[PDB]
Each structure stands twice: as C-alpha cells, then as structure tokens.
Amino acid sequence: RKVLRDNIQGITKPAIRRLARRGGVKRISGLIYEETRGVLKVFLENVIRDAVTYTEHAKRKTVTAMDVVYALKRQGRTLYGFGG
Amino acid sequence: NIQGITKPAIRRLARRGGVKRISGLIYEETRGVLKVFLENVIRDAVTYTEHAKRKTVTAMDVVYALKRQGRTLYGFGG
Amino acid sequence: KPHRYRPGTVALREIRRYQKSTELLIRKLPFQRLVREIAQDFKTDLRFQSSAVMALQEACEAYLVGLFEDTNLCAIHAKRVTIMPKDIQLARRIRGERA
Amino acid sequence: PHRYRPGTVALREIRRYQKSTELLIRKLPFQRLVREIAQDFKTDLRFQSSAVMALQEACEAYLVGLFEDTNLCAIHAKRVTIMPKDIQLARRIRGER
Amino acid sequence: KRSRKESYSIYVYKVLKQVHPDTGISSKAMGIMNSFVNDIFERIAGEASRLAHYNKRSTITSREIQTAVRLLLPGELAKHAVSEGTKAVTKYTSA
Amino acid sequence: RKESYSIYVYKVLKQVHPDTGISSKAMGIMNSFVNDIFERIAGEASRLAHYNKRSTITSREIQTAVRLLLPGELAKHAVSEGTKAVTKYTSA
Amino acid sequence: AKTRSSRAGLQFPVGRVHRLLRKGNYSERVGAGAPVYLAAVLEYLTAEILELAGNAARDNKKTRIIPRHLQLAIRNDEELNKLLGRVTIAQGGVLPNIQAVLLPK
Amino acid sequence: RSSRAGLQFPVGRVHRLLRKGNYSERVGAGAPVYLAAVLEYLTAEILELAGNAARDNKKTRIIPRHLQLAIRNDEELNKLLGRVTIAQGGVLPNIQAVLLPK
DNA sequence: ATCAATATCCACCTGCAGATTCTACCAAAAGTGTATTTGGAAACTGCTCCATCAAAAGGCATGTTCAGCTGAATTCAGCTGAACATGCCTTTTGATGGAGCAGTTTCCAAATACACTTTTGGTAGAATCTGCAGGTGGATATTGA
DNA sequence: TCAATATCCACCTGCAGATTCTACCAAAAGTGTATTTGGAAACTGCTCCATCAAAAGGCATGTTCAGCTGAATTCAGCTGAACATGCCTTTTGATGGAGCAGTTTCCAAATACACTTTTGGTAGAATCTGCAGGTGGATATTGAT
Ligand SMILES: [Mn+2]
C-alpha cells in the first residue's frame, strides 16, 4: 500500500482545542498542541501495544474490539460499549 | 482522640515529603485526610475480619484492605 | 460594523457547545491512519476491526478531555487562565502517569 | 545570641528525616486513633499488635506521598508554603476527592 | 454455522419497562448496560472469589457474595443491594 | 505449617552476593514481593486463557502475561530465563 | 416450570449467573443461593441506573435512553459516580461545567 | 524438579499454588516451571541491586531501606512496584531546587 | 442608558435508519436419582492480647521575636483569540476481491486421577555476629560584623 | 573572610538482640499406571476488512489586528520558623489472666454429577416510529454609540 509517516500531525490543532473546550479550557497556551500530541502518542502506543499483544496470543492477524477493551482494562481505563 | 496526631509530627511527615514551609491551617486539614484514610482502610479491614467470624483483627486483614484501596503494603505477610 | 466578539466570548461559547454534545472531536480518518501507523510499528501486516479503531478513539478522546480538566485546574491553581505544558506536566505527575 | 536564619533548620530537618526510615507519628496516640475508629464499625475488637503496625506504616507512608504532591502543587502556584488548598488539588487530581 | 452470543438485553429491557413503561433504549445504550452488568458481575464474583481463599474455604456461598457487595458497593447503594439480595434468597429457599 | 519463599530468596541472595545477608523484615518484604508478582502473572495468564476459551494455563500464557505485565528490559530478560528454564526441564 | 429466577422473584437469569460463576473459576464450588443473591444485586444496580437514566431522558424530552443520558445519570449520583469512577462511557460526553473564574467579569 | 530446571525456586510449590489457585481448569507442565524462573530471576534482580545498596552504606545485611533504595532508583522496578509501599523504607533523598538557598 | 448584530432557544415537520416484534430451532436451564464432600458444632488448647502498675526522658506545648514570604497593586510587551478568505481532504456511498475469522471434525500429545514411596522444608533449640549506641576531635556549613 | 556558633561525620569500641546454623519429624513433591480430553492440524463457509472511485462542501490553514493576560516588579503587613522553657504523656517492661484464634472428629445438609426432558433466548425477517436535520420567529446576550 502506502508509507505511513508523521501521522501524529493528523491531530489538527483545531481539534485539540475542541478536546480542550469540552474539557473546560478557555485559554490555550501555544506550546500546548505539540505537548498534547506527545501524550496522545504515548497513551495510544501503550493501549495499542497491549491490544496487539492480546491479538498475537490468540494467533490472529486482526485487532478485535475486545483486544482493545481488555487492553484499556489493564491500563485501568475501563471502556463500556464495545464488547459487552 | 484524633487530635493525638500532634502538629509537630505532621511537620515531621511533611519534612520527609520535602516540605520546607508549612501553613498553619494544614495541621487540621492533614488530620482530616489522615482520618478519612484510616476510616476507609479499617472499614474494609474489619469487614474482612467479621466475615472470618473473628473478633481479633489480624495484620492480613489490614493488608487485604490496603490492597483494595490500591495502597498495597509489603513485608507484613509474615 | 464590523461586529467583533471580545476575546473569551467565543471560547466560552465553545466550552458550552462542546460539553452539551458527545460527538468525537478528532477527525475519524487522521486518527485511523495514526493508529495504523503506530500499530504497524509493533507488528507489520495487521488488520483492524472497524470498531477496534472506534474504541481506541473513544478512549483516547475521553482520556485527553479528562486530562485537560485536571490540566485546567492546575492553571487556575497558579492563578492563570491559560493552560500551558507546565500545567499538563504537573497533572500527569500528580496522577502517576510519569512521576 | 546565635540564631539560625528562618528556614535553615527546615532543610536540615528534611535532610535528617529523609535519611531515616523510623516511623514519625507517636505510636500510642495512633494506636488509640485506630481502636477508636474501628470501634465505630465493630465492638470488643482486638487488633493484633502487628495489624496496628501495618496501619501505621501504610497510613504514614501515604501522608508523606500526599505531601510530596502537595509540595509540587504549592511550588506550581509560585509559592513555597504548603497550604490546605494545595493538598486539596493534589487529592482532587489523584482521584481521591 | 450460527454462533449464538448471549447478553443481558432481555433482562435489562424487562427492568427498564418496570421503571419506565413509556421509555425505550437504543442499540448503543443497551451495549453500555450490557458492559455495566458484566463488569459489576466480574467485580462481585472476583471479590467473593478472593474472600473464600483468604479463608481457605473451597466454596462461594451467598454469604461471600454479600461481603463482596459491602466491600465493593459504596453507601446506600450497598444497603439497598444487600437488602434486595437477601429478600431474593430467603424467598428462593421457601420456594 | 505456614510456608514461604524465605528459604529460596536466601539461596538466590547467596548466588548474587555470597558475603551479604538479609534482615528479618527485609526478608519479609522480599517474601511479599514474590507473592504479589506471582499473583499478577497468574491472574493475568488466568485471563488470557479465559478470553481465548481455553481451560488450561500453559507456559505460553505465563509468557504473554509477562510481556503485558513487566516493563521494558525486565520483560525481555524475564522472558528468556522463563524460556531458558523450560528448555532445560524438557531436555532431561 | 419454576425457573430459579421466578422462585426468587427476580427478573435477571438466576441460572445464567450460577453457570457463569461455576465456569469463571472463582471457586471450586458454588452455593445454591449465591447466583440468586448476586443476580438480584445486578438487577437492583441495573434498575438503579435505568431509573436515573430514564429520567435524564425525560428531562431532555426524549422517549429513548441514549448513552449520554446514562452518563448524565452516573455522573450526577455521587455513589454511581464512584462505583464507575474509572469507567469510560462511549458516546457519553461530560457533565456541563465551567470553572467560575473563567466566566465573564 | 526445580533442580531439573536449574532453579532455586520450587517448581512444584508453584505448580501446587497454580492448580489450587482457581486460575484455570488445568495447569500445563511447563507453566509452573516458566513462572518459577521468572519469580527467581526478578528476585535476583532486586537482591543484586539491594546488595550493592548494602555495601554502599558499609553494611553487610540487607534491610528494608536497602530494597527501597534499590527499587526506587531503577526506573523499571520502580514502575513495576509503583503502587507498592515498602514497610520501613523511607523516601529517596530529594529536595526541590526552588527550596534551596540563593 | 440605547440598539443593532448574532448566536441560541424551542416548537414543529416528516420520512427512514434504527428499534420493536414475531417466529422458529436448540443450546441450556431444569427435574431426579445417586455419589461425594464440606464446613460447621462441641472440645480444648497454647496463644497472643489487654490490663494495670510505675517509674524517667524524651517530646509536646507555649510565649517571644521578627525574617522574608505571601498578596495586593501596577505596568506593559506581546501572546493568543476572533475573523475571514483559501481550496484541501475528510466524508459519504457503493462495489468488490479475498484475507482470515470461526464452526466442525479428527485424535493424539498431554494434563488428571489415584494410591505409594521418598525427601524437603518448617520448627525450635543452639552457636554466631552485625549494628546499635556513645564517645571524641576536627572539619563543615551558617551567620554576624 | 574572619570568627564564634552549632552541627554533622568518620574512627573505634563493646554486648545483646537478632541472624544463621543444626537437628529431626509431617506434608508434600515425585513415581508408576490407567484415564480423560482439550485444542492443534485440517478444511472451509462467508462476514468483514482493505481498497478504489467521485463528488462536494465541511474545515484546517494562514495572515491580520489588537484585546487583555501573564510576567515582571514594587511594597509592607503579618504569618509562622527558630528558640529557650516547663511539664506530662509516651516508652517499656514485665507479669498475669483470659478471650480467642486454631485443631480435631463426627457427620447432616448441601453440592456435585450424569442424563433426560422442556423451555427460554438468540438469530433473522417483518412492522413500526423516534427524532436527526432543517426551517423560522422569539429570545436573550454582546458589543458599539
Ligand atoms: Mn512505521
């Protein structure tokens, strides 16, 4: 297919602001955006890494929704609405 | 009874915490937090006790209670 | 005129608007892509269930919205109103995400 | 008249207490606090000696952590005197309150 | 060539209708509730699981489930739970 | 009755540091550490088995459980020793 | 004819629960009342959330409970909020709340 | 057996703890072994670092503070036990620079 | 103290994607006759756990001073929100090819079940020791002139 | 710095409380055989996922402008650290007695088990219908005169 690259930038600033508004933030410093992408990349990696590990253990090439729900569980971030 | 946790001790605890200057209201606040902690850890502990029909609260009861609270303690399994 | 809302008027308007709703705030594609990029770096030739991605996104977005509040509180705490990386760093530390 | 500037001892006290591990809170007042509280939940209760040590180590060790976080909070607001508000923030962010 | 996956929808729905005869619940909504029951179930059963062991007792009696509730549930939620749980059991036995 | 890992911990303390010895409390901590980790690895393996509708906890489970459970380096070395100990058990 | 659930006067599948316990490996054996006791707690708790959700959907003028309502429900009742403190609800959004200082002079 | 797997930690002891632990219907043959070694290993990992901690203070007897000083100084172990409290351990010597004179 | 300029509020409309129902099969409770256990209930232990009793010694509580820290005010460069014009690319919908989940079977390699045989590991004495606990004496780090 | 405090810190030293080693018995761990079976190999149907195509209008970007924030300072009232005092409440150390965890030992009631019935649920088609998307005045709310 194609070569994925620098896609952590797909997370546009307007959006990050949006996420912040829902959060309650009314004034966002400028250095915030690059910071946020930073945390998001790290949070994601961990949730994904774990997920994929559950995938491999079931010897499957597909990342199922449960693989994510269980991952989030270990991480403490329990999710409702995707796998009973 | 709680006022037994003398102000000087609280300062000592905060000292270990890296604290340099301590406000005056702190002490009362610290006693509240400290009380709520124990209040929560024992409640779960005694419950564990009662269930075992005991009348005597063993250390394992505190250890188990400290785990539910996510405050795991090592060296008291002995 | 031209009519110009004073700085902060629209910001609050948004804060109210985006809290009254529950739609994802990150665009679905760039996220998907981002995910696949990261997952590709852990194991090549992976296929994602359409929903597995929705999950990650439902979580990521909940996570960050949740981080921003604690963030916002730290700025308020330092008398400021502008969240800065400094605020985020404290929020995560306290949290235990990276003591 | 020799007087140590204000705040010189503190540092020396921090260096002192951080270098040690012994418990800080006076044992009897504590054990008393334990029994009192536990009695609000059950009667004719008997804490086996070590159980109360488990609680002290636990309890004291928690308070310390909280203080370390409260420092950063106090520091973050440009101050250097832990205030009750700082403790509250620290606890709120933590998920306790 | 079928694959019947179970859930609590039938039960979640019988209950929704007892509390709100005119209200309904969408797909996602149900899926949320399905998770909630499962999670809670896993917590209760898990805690009980641990109590029986902390006491070297090979069986999970309803008496364990109850302590599991008290430890797991906060406040009145627990009181009403414990209450509701007993009513069901005492009645069940007299059946 | 009432066992522990005290015995072993000490045997291992002697391999890494024959000259040193461990306190009572310290040995008590070490004894608590073993149990927790054991508890985590097992509990985790326990779940992988369940998620995958399998009624037997194999060593493959213990392993996957270890990659999820242990951080960076510890994880790698922990996996080796684990895989390294298993081969020797099957050899003879 | 007497399904164990009906004997206890419960709406949740008492037998379903009994089995899950057996096959969950929580204990070598399971009492005969546990599943009934627990099945009732899941019922009560469930009934408790629908109660507050249904209402939340009433306030909003909707006759169909969506997740959002569920969220508004759980984050407004102190206890459920705590019972589901580390729980994230997909499509739930967050309780409206703007720090005082932020508002206009 | 443990001696067969070239370990100090009891493979049987573990196998017993696993089967009787409610972890799953049956425990595979190599499971207890694998886990045992992982249990040993980790120990060695902490001892070696605490050992050093001992000699580091002119002692020859590892005590709690020696463990904590070995556990909170290593990032990985610190992470692994980040929600664990060592009795009689104390905190690592730390003073914020802002608190320092000058 | 007014009045445009807008963004938000509510009620109303109406088809269709998303519930609600309505039926059939069947995997799963249910009903019963057996085959085990399990975990109380009495009975007694040796524990460990309170209870006083009774001194001294830190360790706590106070009242004084006043160092310098926390707050309240100003000030101003310039950081960041509000806008608007640009035209990019995320969305929407459909249509396929086909990779790879899973549902079934087939069956050994492997884990379990007894019933014994041997050895290890926990206990409670018995034989060491490491650190604690004080003591000088002399740099060290503070602080006033 | 010079000097006059108080403070640490190694350098050694002497016993007792922990440590570690011994010396011996039960509870397990390891064997030998006979049973069960769980899930790896082997297909194979078919959802679901990866992809490509096109149109278009919802937004992300970028550049202006300047409002008002954050950060830098200045300034002094007063909170709270450093201290020297005077006192009582914590330490501890047995010593004794007694509630109480822990063990055994019968066993009645409660479970587990293996089949054989009998539904209660789940997986689709067939009917409904909230309400998602828009439409417009009626309200406030804001920001400029
Ligand atoms: Mn890559």
Q: Residue B11 maps to which CATH number?
A: 1.10.20.10
Please indicate whether, in this complex, the C-beta atoms of E36 and A81 are within 8 angstroms of each other. no
**Separation CA G43–CA D91 (nearest Å):** 33
Q: Record the tokens describing residue F33, joined without a space.
A: 């550490």
CA angle (E25, E28, E31) in 5-degree steps: 90
Pick from D60, H94, H86: which is nearest to B9 by CA? D60
CA-to-CA dists, residue H80 to C7, G87, H46, H87, angstroms? 47, 23, 12, 17
Q: Structure resolution in Å?
A: 3.0
Q: Record the tokens describing residue B39, joined without a space.
A: 């209040």
Interatomic CA–C1' length for residue G3 and nucleotide J120, angstroms: 10
- Residue appearing with tokens 């607001």: D77
CA-to-CA dists, residue F54 to A12, A56, A72, E29, F51, angstroms? 44, 15, 22, 31, 8
The DSSP call for residue H74 is S
Amino acid identity at F72: G
Number of domains chain C contains: 1
For residues D94 and D72, is the Cβ–Cβ distance under 8 A?
Answer: no
C-alpha of residue C35 to centroid of ligand 1, in Å = 11
The H helix count followed by the E strand count for chain H is: 4, 3
Closest Cβ–Cβ partner in E12, E29, E39 for G66: E29
For residues A65 and A53, is the Cβ–Cβ distance under 8 A?
Answer: no
**Separation CA H91–CA D21 (nearest Å):** 8
Q: What is the largest CA-CA distance in chain G?
A: 69
Query: What's the domain range around C58?
Result: 1-99
C-alpha of residue E76 to centroid of ligand 1, in Å = 52
For residues G48 and E77, is the Cβ–Cβ distance under 8 A?
Answer: yes
Q: Record the tokens describing residue B20, joined without a space.
A: 């340099």
CA-to-CA dists, residue B31 to B25, B34, D83, D84, G40, angstroms? 10, 5, 14, 11, 39
Residues in G 1-60 with any Cβ partner in H closer than 8 A: 25-28
**Separation CA E26–CA A53 (nearest Å):** 33
Instruction: Label each residue of G49-88 as H, E or C.
Output: HHHHHHHHHHHCCCCEECHHHHHHHHCCCHHHHHHCCCEE
For residues C16 and G96, is the Cβ–Cβ distance under 8 A?
Answer: yes
Compute the radius of gyration of chain B from its Cα atoms: 15
CA angle (G22, G28, G33) in 5-degree steps: 55
- Helix segments in D1-97, DSSP class H: 8-19, 27-39, 49-76, 84-94
* F50 contacts in chain G (CB < 8 Å): 24-25
C-alpha of residue A11 to centroid of ligand 1, in Å = 17
Architecture of domain H1-102: Orthogonal Bundle (1.10)
CATH topology of domain G1-105: Histone, subunit A (1.10.20)
**Separation CA E62–CA H59 (nearest Å):** 53
Query: What's the domain range around A74?
Result: 1-84
Output the CA torsion sign for D42, D43, D47, D52. positive
For residues A70 and F51, is the Cβ–Cβ distance under 8 A?
Answer: yes
Q: Is the omega angle on the peptide bond into residue H101 within 30 degrees of 0, that is, cis?
A: no
The total of other beta-carbon atoms located within 10 Å of residue E21's CB is: 8
- Helix segments in C21-49, DSSP class H: 28-40
**What is residue G39's three-state secondary structure?**
helix
If you write DSSP's letter for every residue of A1-69 in order, what string do you get?
A: -----SGGGGS-HHHHHHHHHHHT-SEE-TTHHHHHHHHHHHHHHHHHHHHHHHHHHTT-SEE-HHHHH
Amino acid identity at B37: F
**Separation CA D29–CA D34 (nearest Å):** 9
**Separation CA H42–CA A46 (nearest Å):** 23
Exposed, middle or buried by CB within 10 Å (0-12, 13-18, 19+), for H101? exposed
CA-to-CA dists, residue E10 to D12, G2, G20, G36, G50, angstroms? 67, 18, 17, 18, 14
Ordered by where they begin, the domains of chain E are 1-95 (1.10.20.10)
For residues H69 and D50, is the Cβ–Cβ distance under 8 A?
Answer: no
CATH of the domain at D39: 1.10.20.10
* F64 contacts in chain A (CB < 8 Å): 53, 56-57
**Separation CA A47–CA A40 (nearest Å):** 11
